[PDB]
C-alpha cells in the first residue's frame, strides 16, 4: 500500500480520490480492470475509509 506498490494504479487512485471527492468504488473497479491489474475490492473499500478519516493534501489554502 504505502510504498506505492502498483505505480500506475495506486498513484492514480490516491491523487483522484483526494482531489475529486466525487470519485467512488464503481469508478475505481472500472479503472483497475481497464489497466488489467487484479486488485481485491476489500483493499479498495478500506482505503476509501482511510481517506475519509484523513485526506492528505497540498492544495488550496494548506
Automatic annotation (TrEMBL):
Protein name (record): Uncharacterized protein
Residues of the full protein shown: 50 to 106 of 140
Residue stretches making up the Transposase Tc1-like domain: 11-60
Amino acid at each position: 500500500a504505502s510504498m506505492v506498490l502498483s505505480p500506475r494504479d495506486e498513484r492514480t487512485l490516491v491523487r483522484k480520490v483526494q482531489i475529486n471527492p466525487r470519485t467512488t468504488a464503481k469508478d475505481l473497479v472500472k479503472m483497475l480492470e481497464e489497466t488489467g491489474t487484479k486488485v481485491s475490492i476489500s483493499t479498495v473499500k478500506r482505503v476509501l475509509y482511510r481517506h475519509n478519516l484523513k485526506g492528505r493534501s497540498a492544495r488550496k489554502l494548506e
